[PDB]
Design an enzyme around this catalytic site. Structure first.
Site, mmCIF file in Angstrom:
data_model
loop_
_atom_site.group_PDB
_atom_site.id
_atom_site.type_symbol
_atom_site.label_atom_id
_atom_site.label_comp_id
_atom_site.label_asym_id
_atom_site.label_seq_id
_atom_site.Cartn_x
_atom_site.Cartn_y
_atom_site.Cartn_z
ATOM 1 N N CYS A 103 0.834 -1.186 0.000
ATOM 2 C CA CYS A 103 0.000 0.000 0.000
ATOM 3 C C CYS A 103 0.879 1.249 0.000
ATOM 4 C CB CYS A 103 -0.916 -0.005 1.222
ATOM 5 S SG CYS A 103 -1.896 1.488 1.497
ATOM 6 N N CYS A 119 -6.232 -1.927 -1.448
ATOM 7 C CA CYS A 119 -5.552 -2.514 -0.300
ATOM 8 C C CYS A 119 -6.493 -3.452 0.444
ATOM 9 C CB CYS A 119 -5.043 -1.415 0.629
ATOM 10 S SG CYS A 119 -4.038 -1.993 2.016
ATOM 11 N N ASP A 126 -0.528 0.205 -28.486
ATOM 12 C CA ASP A 126 0.955 0.278 -28.368
ATOM 13 C C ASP A 126 1.335 0.404 -26.889
ATOM 14 O OD1 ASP A 126 -0.233 2.760 -28.336
ATOM 15 O OD2 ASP A 126 1.305 3.763 -29.547
ATOM 16 N N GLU A 127 0.644 1.279 -26.153
ATOM 17 C CA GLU A 127 0.915 1.437 -24.700
ATOM 18 C C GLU A 127 0.490 0.150 -23.983
ATOM 19 O OE1 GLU A 127 0.609 5.072 -26.498
ATOM 20 O OE2 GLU A 127 -0.858 5.492 -24.917
HETATM 21 MG MG LIG Z 1 2.274 5.024 -28.011
HETATM 22 MG MG LIG Z 2 3.024 7.855 -29.066
HETATM 23 ZN ZN LIG Z 3 -3.409 0.154 2.701
#
Ligand SMILES: [Mg+2]
Ligand SMILES: [Mg+2]
Ligand SMILES: [Zn+2]
Ligand SMILES: [Zn+2]
Ligand SMILES: [Zn+2]
Ligand SMILES: [Zn+2]
Lengths: 54, 67, 48, 101, 49, 243, 16, 335, 50, 98, 340
Positions: A14, A45, A36-37
């Protein structure tokens, strides 16, 4: 009441460790901004109940 | 189009081995790997420079405008 | 810091007024002229 | 006299010259590494290292810090002569070995 | 001295564009939240958006 | 920003300041504007300058900090297994600077049988290289992975992994350099502390030092991923199947 | 095998 | 561990020299000639026209690497720089043809040429000592014979293939005498330069020149020049038996051998082991072997492109390093 | 000494050489093809082996 | 799908909030001089330059830093009452000010 | 459409931080990622109701007997010579339009080549339409070297922009001296979860050594154990990790490096076609603001979001400069008793 049991669990820390000691957390990998990302993982928690994402 | 003169990684001249490779494949039938090794191509970069080649010029030359 | 290409740095001028502290560098830029990177592109006189 | 190949960076240079930095034009890792290795065997050198500030430019900064005995300039001259002698040894040994065959 | 300096420092300075700062500080996180009530499977609690 | 004329065609920026733009060098394009007046120039540099915008205003947390390789290189340097002799130490310091920075070497952590500095010492020198730099940094912080000590009575530094990070007087005493200590999103950071205590110029200087050192260190050190990194051992073919 | 370097003059290594 | 680089199963340890006053209490390992002189040794394993497998001992990687870098990118050579086209009626573009010609290597010994000054206009830039002129002209026509059709473009056409042995030397000025006993010629005369069909012609002139490999890879005189550290295998806990054959199978075939009567195994020949650390996959030789490489013992291999000889190339690298050290020493230190 | 740096058309079908007088036709002659391409220039064109 | 809605939301948020400014009397007002907040957040504290725990000073770090900065071996240790005597000699005029 | 590069998955030089690649100079020199562009220009000589044609004559010659600079690559016909080089301002099609279209009157409206780099005329074609109006086509070619900023990809979605080009000697090498063409950051693999890339590298290495091409197909293809056996029968590590040396310091690297061939591909996005900059120039006739064309000196737009950011910084004079002075500043006269 709710069944936090039988929910996905991982092993993380946490952000507010100095307050509550959280060595596990619930998660889902259900946020994908772009192809792509890489994916995004949301946590909460299991000890205190703090939601955050990575 | 045609075989590159040198190799992109080493610089070893492979421009003079395309015809030898084809002749070894056709006459005196040989495995591709053994043909490459008989041609003095030992590094994998030089081996790929001849294995992964498409001879497009023989197909471009069927369309010459001065027939 | 950001790194600008010379090709776009030769077209994106900044107008520097002659002010008794940069006259020498400004005339050196004028002499260099638009061809070289440390140079200038336009001139604008006071009365004109 | 080619008074452009070596510049003494004065801002890096300290008073008494026990620590100094030099700028060498048209040099790269090839000479920087060899010179640094040779200089680090000087029993008076405490700090020696080089860097190439930008891959675009053709430069090489080299830093030398010594204890009090010797100065950085003299340490650099000794390192250059030392490298020259190393090269003569290698040249002579290789030449005589090839001559014998 | 350290604490007093830090406290005298942390004050909203006159002229701040605090409205636009806050508007962007709310809108910018708002562009990442899904247009959906995603939740961890296996609970089936009450439905709230 | 500040302009820097260069021989190629792209716009170049330090990878630390990629986070505020959300840029990823995969074909991303950016726009450049040149203010044409003294007043516009001065306001631009004094209010939107990078050094003056290291902290996001939605939370107050650092936003300009290290990135993936600039973090893994720091961690590999300051790992507990890393020992450096004087030649390696001085080459690392020269790589960190441009070969222009003075350093005064501290006594080594091992004086027998050899003289060997540790990675935490080279990073302490990165934070403060000379008796002339006025940067004294005190910091307690917890790395994002922290295994607690054997006994609950022990302090945090006694963690199994390096874990807790202690910095007293600009000297690193324990703990690895991490995303928690160098990255963004946490207020207990080295760059955040340097900023808040000694101004943004020194924070910029330390960040530049780290970037220049990690650019040159990792290529000569070595780091890769392959099929054997994600290959599971034969015991898993049994365990996973049964379970 | 021949140590041609001791005999021949080297104009190439002469810097321009 | 005293100049042995430890080859583990997940890392490589002991990679730095560690010989200087400052490594330990005793300020030993200080530089002095007449000790480097005795320590240093050159063994020449094999020799050939375009080949040199020699072996250096008791130097630093910081010097062997300098030799390798200079050999790759600092020893000058000769290759065509400008191509002048009179006629090109092939499918291959003119710039593509020019690039291939510039990539063709030439069997011309340097030091017989001089450096072109770039501060001069074109009409006096080149001289009879600066430049070598190569020419080419081929005219593909139909075949004036009667073979069976649908055959290859070798007997079906006239000079349908353009090689490197089609470039002709054209001496100019004093070059009629100096080059009389050594005409320039491609080192690899079978390089396919272009292909063409009937009715198509190529005609050009090339202006070869001295050049450096750090400016273009066509000027580099070595196909590759590189070194490898000497491998070492330490055997303890004799491995006699049917495990000896399996331990032998973990290496290239001629590297280690098995005694017949003794039934054991021993290190037959290093310099044949490529360090794949396969023995570390089995955990039964976990404490019966410890791989390594000697940090001081370099095994050099040099392959020449064809102009020079490899030993001349290596010597030129050493002398180039010495010459730049000397020039830097002689330069005045401007403040 | 110093070395010193040193109209036609083709039918698209029958590959025959033509010359175009002014205001005659823009076709071929041996065949009747209607597309013509300029021949390669006669001038010297220099390149760089880079 | 969500991009368009988020962009529209940000634009209208900016339209509503665009002209609000802290003034030299510390009040947050509008362009029309209408006083919407009497002190920012009821505190007057800029969220950007504030340390953790919703407080603008990390007393813990500040104590460790101050101690480390002022470490001398030969400095006599104050008794527990004298610590408060100095702390209340400094603090307290700042309270009579209010 | 691609080339099999020798790749070393490694962190090198710090110029490969996030989807940025390191390209080997001297691999470019030997010709690697070398491409060609080809555009065309079409002109039509149409007939008018006045029976008046358009002419394609020209080639204005100078006093010494050579064409003017704008006509240097033109030839007598008014059509550029097949093989010559054109530059910015040079004319390669010389069209004249009658002044009385709405034949002793003509206005010259030729085709002027504007471009950032010189290109070569490689094909000139003349034909006639059904109505028999002349139609002329000119094909221009341009040869392009993989500059810094060109985009690559590897069939696994790991697209990237070339970040730095380094000399061959500053490259890690193995025992044989093989130097990689491309180096890619290992940080792109774990979060994106592309292990098909890793199996492709191993299979390609084994296939190159064995002399056969390998099959990676969905739910099948060459097995990893077979490739590992083939790779170990030739003295290479079973996992494709090799002990390389640094090229800058010469000594062994402390980590084994993933080494092998990965098939890459060059993408059509090139920094040459994107680099744009404007100082002043063409403006819209209605608003007198900079134009917006990709071809003209199209100014860059500072939109609503951007002015919102600039307001948030509290910068008034910069708003004044960027939104009035440098976009459209106009002097006007306004009455003081009436607001007109
Ligand atoms: Mg990208
Ligand atoms: Mg980009
Ligand atoms: Zn926590
Ligand atoms: Zn090769
Ligand atoms: Zn015809
Ligand atoms: Zn009025």
């Amino acid at each position: 009441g709710g069944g936090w049991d039988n929910v996905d669990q991982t092993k993380t820390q946490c952000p507010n460790y100095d307050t509550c000691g959280g060595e596990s957390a619930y998660f889902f990998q259900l946020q994908i901004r772009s192809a792509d990302e890489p994916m995004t993982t949301f946590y909460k928690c299991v000890n205190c109940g703090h939601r955050w994402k990575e | 189009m045609i075989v590159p003169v040198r190799c992109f990684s080493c610089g070893k001249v492979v421009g003079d081995k395309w015809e030898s490779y084809l002749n070894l494949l056709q006459e005196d039938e040989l495995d591709e790997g053994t043909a490459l090794s008989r041609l003095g191509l030992k590094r994998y970069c030089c081996r790929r420079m001849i294995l992964t080649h498409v001879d497009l010029i023989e197909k471009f030359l069927r369309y010459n405008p001065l027939e | 810091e950001v790194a600008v290409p010379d090709r776009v740095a030769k077209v994106l001028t900044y107008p520097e007024k002659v002010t008794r502290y940069n006259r020498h560098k400004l005339q050196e830029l004028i002499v260099n002229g638009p061809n070289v990177h440390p140079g200038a592109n336009y001139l604008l006189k006071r009365n004109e | 006299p080619d008074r452009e190949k070596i510049k003494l960076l004065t801002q890096a240079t300290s008073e008494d010259g026990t620590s100094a930095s030099f700028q060498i034009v048209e040099e790269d890792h090839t000479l920087g590494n060899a010179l640094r290795y040779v200089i680090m065997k000087n029993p008076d050198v405490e700090f020696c290292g080089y860097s190439i500030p930008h891959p675009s430019e053709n430069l090489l900064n080299i830093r030398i810090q010594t204890y009090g005995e010797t100065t950085a300039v003299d340490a650099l001259q000794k390192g250059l002569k030392d490298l020259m002698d190393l090269c003569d040894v290698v040249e002579s040994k290789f030449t005589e070995k090839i001559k014998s065959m | 001295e350290i604490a007093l300096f830090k406290y005298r420092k942390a004050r909203l300075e006159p002229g701040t564009a605090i409205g636009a700062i806050g508007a962007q500080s709310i809108g910018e996180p708002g562009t990442q939240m899904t247009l959906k009530t995603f939740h961890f499977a296996g609970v089936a609690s009450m439905n709230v958006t | 920003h500040y302009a820097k004329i260069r021989p190629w065609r792209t716009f170049r920026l330090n990878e630390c300041v990629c986070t505020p733009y959300n840029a990823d060098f995969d074909g991303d394009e950016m726009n450049l504007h040149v203010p044409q007046t003294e007043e516009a120039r001065a306001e631009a540099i004094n209010l939107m300058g990078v050094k003056n915008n290291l902290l996001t205003p939605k939370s107050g947390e650092p936003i300009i900090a290290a990135t993936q390789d600039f973090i893994t290189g720091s961690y590999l340097i300051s790992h507990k297994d890393s020992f450096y002799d004087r030649a390696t130490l001085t080459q690392l310091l020269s790589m960190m600077s441009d070969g222009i920075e003075h350093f005064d070497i501290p006594p080594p952590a091992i004086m027998k049988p050899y003289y060997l500095w540790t990675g935490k010492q080279v990073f302490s020198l990165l934070i403060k290289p000379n008796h002339n730099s006025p940067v004294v940094i005190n910091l307690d912080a917890k790395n994002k992975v922290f295994v607690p000590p054997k006994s609950k009575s022990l302090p945090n530094e006694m963690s199994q992994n390096d874990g807790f990070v202690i910095i007293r007087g600009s000297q690193i005493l324990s703990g690895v350099m991490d995303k928690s200590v160098l990255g963004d999103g946490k207020k207990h950071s080295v760059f955040y502390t340097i900023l808040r205590d000694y101004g943004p110029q020194e924070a910029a200087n330390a960040m530049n030092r780290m970037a220049k050192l990690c650019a040159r260190f990792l290529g000569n050190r070595g780091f890769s991923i392959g099929i054997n990194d994600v290959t599971p051992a034969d015991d898993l073919k049994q365990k996973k199947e049964e379970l | 095998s021949r140590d041609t370097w001791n005999t021949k003059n080297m104009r190439s290594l002469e810097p321009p | 561990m005293s100049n042995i680089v430890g080859i583990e199963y997940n890392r490589v340890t002991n990679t730095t020299s560690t010989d200087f006053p400052g490594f330990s209490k005793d300020a030993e390992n200080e530089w002095n000639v007449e000790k480097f002189k005795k320590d240093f040794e050159v063994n020449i394993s094999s020799l050939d026209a375009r080949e040199a497998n020699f072996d250096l001992i008791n130097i630093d990687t910081s010097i062997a690497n300098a030799f390798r870098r200079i050999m790759i990118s600092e020893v000058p050579s000769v290759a065509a720089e400008y191509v002048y086209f009179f006629n090109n009626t092939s499918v291959i573009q003119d710039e593509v043809l020019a690039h291939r010609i510039g990539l063709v290597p030439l069997k011309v010994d340097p030091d017989m040429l001089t450096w072109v000054d770039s501060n001069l206009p074109d009409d006096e830039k080149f001289t009879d000592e600066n430049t070598i002129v190569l020419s080419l002209n081929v005219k593909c026509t139909r075949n004036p014979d009667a073979p069976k059709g649908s055959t290859d473009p070798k007997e079906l056409y006239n000079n349908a293939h353009v090689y490197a042995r089609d470039l002709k030397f054209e001496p100019q000025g004093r070059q009629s005498t100096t080059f009389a006993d050594c005409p320039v010629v491609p080192a690899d005369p079978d390089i396919l330069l272009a292909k063409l069909r009937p009715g198509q012609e190529i005609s050009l002139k090339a202006h070869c020149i001295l050049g450096i490999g750090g400016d273009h890879a066509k000027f580099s005189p070595v196909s590759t020049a590189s070194y490898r550290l000497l491998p070492q295998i330490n055997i303890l806990q004799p491995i006699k038996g049917e495990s000896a054959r399996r331990f032998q199978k973990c290496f290239p075939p001629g590297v280690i051998g098995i005694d017949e009567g003794s039934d054991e195994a021993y290190v037959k020949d290093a310099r044949k082991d490529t360090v794949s650390r396969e023995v570390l996959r089995y955990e039964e030789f976990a404490d019966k072997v410890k791989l390594g490489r000697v940090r001081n013992h370099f095994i050099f291999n040099v392959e020449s492109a064809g102009a020079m000889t490899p030993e001349e190339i290596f010597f030129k690298s050493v002398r180039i390093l010495k010459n730049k050290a000397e020039y830097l020493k002689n330069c005045p230190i401007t403040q | 000494x110093x070395x010193x740096x040193x109209l036609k058309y083709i039918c698209a079908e029958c590959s025959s050489k033509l010359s175009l007088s002014r205001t005659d036709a823009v076709r071929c002659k041996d065949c009747g093809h209607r597309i013509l391409l300029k021949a390669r220039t006669k001038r010297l064109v220099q390149f760089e082996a880079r | 799908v969500k991009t368009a809605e988020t962009g529209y939301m940000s634009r209208r948020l900016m339209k509503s909030l665009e002209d609000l400014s802290c003034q030299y009397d510390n009040t947050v007002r509008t362009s029309a001089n209408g006083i919407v907040q009497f002190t920012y957040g009821g505190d007057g504290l800029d969220p950007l330059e504030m340390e953790g725990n919703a407080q603008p000073v990390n007393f813990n770090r500040s104590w460790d830093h101050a101690y480390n900065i002022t470490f001398n071996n030969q400095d006599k240790g104050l008794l527990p009452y004298a610590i408060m005597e100095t702390a209340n000699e400094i603090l307290g005029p700042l309270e009579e000010r209010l | 459409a691609g080339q099999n590069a020798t790749v070393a998955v490694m962190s090198y030089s710090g110029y490969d931080i996030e989807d940025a690649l390191v390209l080997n100079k001297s691999s470019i020199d030997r010709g690697f990622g070398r491409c060609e562009t080809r555009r065309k220009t079409t002109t039509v000589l149409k007939r008018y109701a006045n029976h008046t044609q358009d002419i394609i004559g020209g080639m204005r010659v100078d006093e010494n007997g050579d064409p003017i600079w704008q006509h240097q690559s033109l030839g007598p016909d008014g059509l550029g010579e097949v093989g010559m080089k054109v530059q910015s301002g040079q004319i390669y099609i010389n069209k004249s339009v009658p002044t009385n279209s709405a034949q002793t009157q003509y206005r010259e409206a030729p085709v002027i080549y504007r471009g950032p780099e010189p290109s070569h005329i490689d094909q000139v074609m003349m034909s006639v339409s059904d109505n028999d109006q002349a139609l002329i086509k000119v094909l221009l070619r341009q040869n392009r070297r993989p500059e810094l900023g060109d985009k690559f990809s590897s069939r696994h979605g790991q697209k990237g922009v070339c970040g730095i080009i380094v000399k061959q000697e500053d490259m890690p090498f193995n025992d044989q001296g093989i130097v990689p063409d491309i180096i890619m950051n290992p940080h792109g693999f774990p979060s994106r979860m592309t292990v098909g890339k890793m199996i492709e590298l191993i299979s390609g290495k084994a296939g190159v050594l064995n002399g056969t091409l390998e099959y990676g197909t969905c739910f099948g293809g060459s097995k990893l154990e077979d490739m590992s056996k083939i790779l170990v029968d030739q003295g290479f590590n079973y996992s494709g990790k090799d002990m390389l040396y640094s090229g800058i310091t010469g000594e062994c690297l402390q980590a084994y490096i993933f080494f092998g061939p990965i098939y890459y591909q060059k993408l059509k996005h090139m920094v040459l076609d994107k680099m744009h900059a404007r100082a002043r120039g063409p403006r819209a006739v209605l608003t007198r603001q900079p134009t917006e064309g990709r071809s003209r000196d199209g100014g860059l737009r500072l939109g609503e979001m951007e002015r919102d950011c600039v307001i948030a910084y509290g910068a008034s004079q910069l708003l004044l400069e960027r939104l009035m002075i440098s976009s459209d500043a106009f002097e006007v006269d306004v009455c003081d008793k009436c607001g007109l």
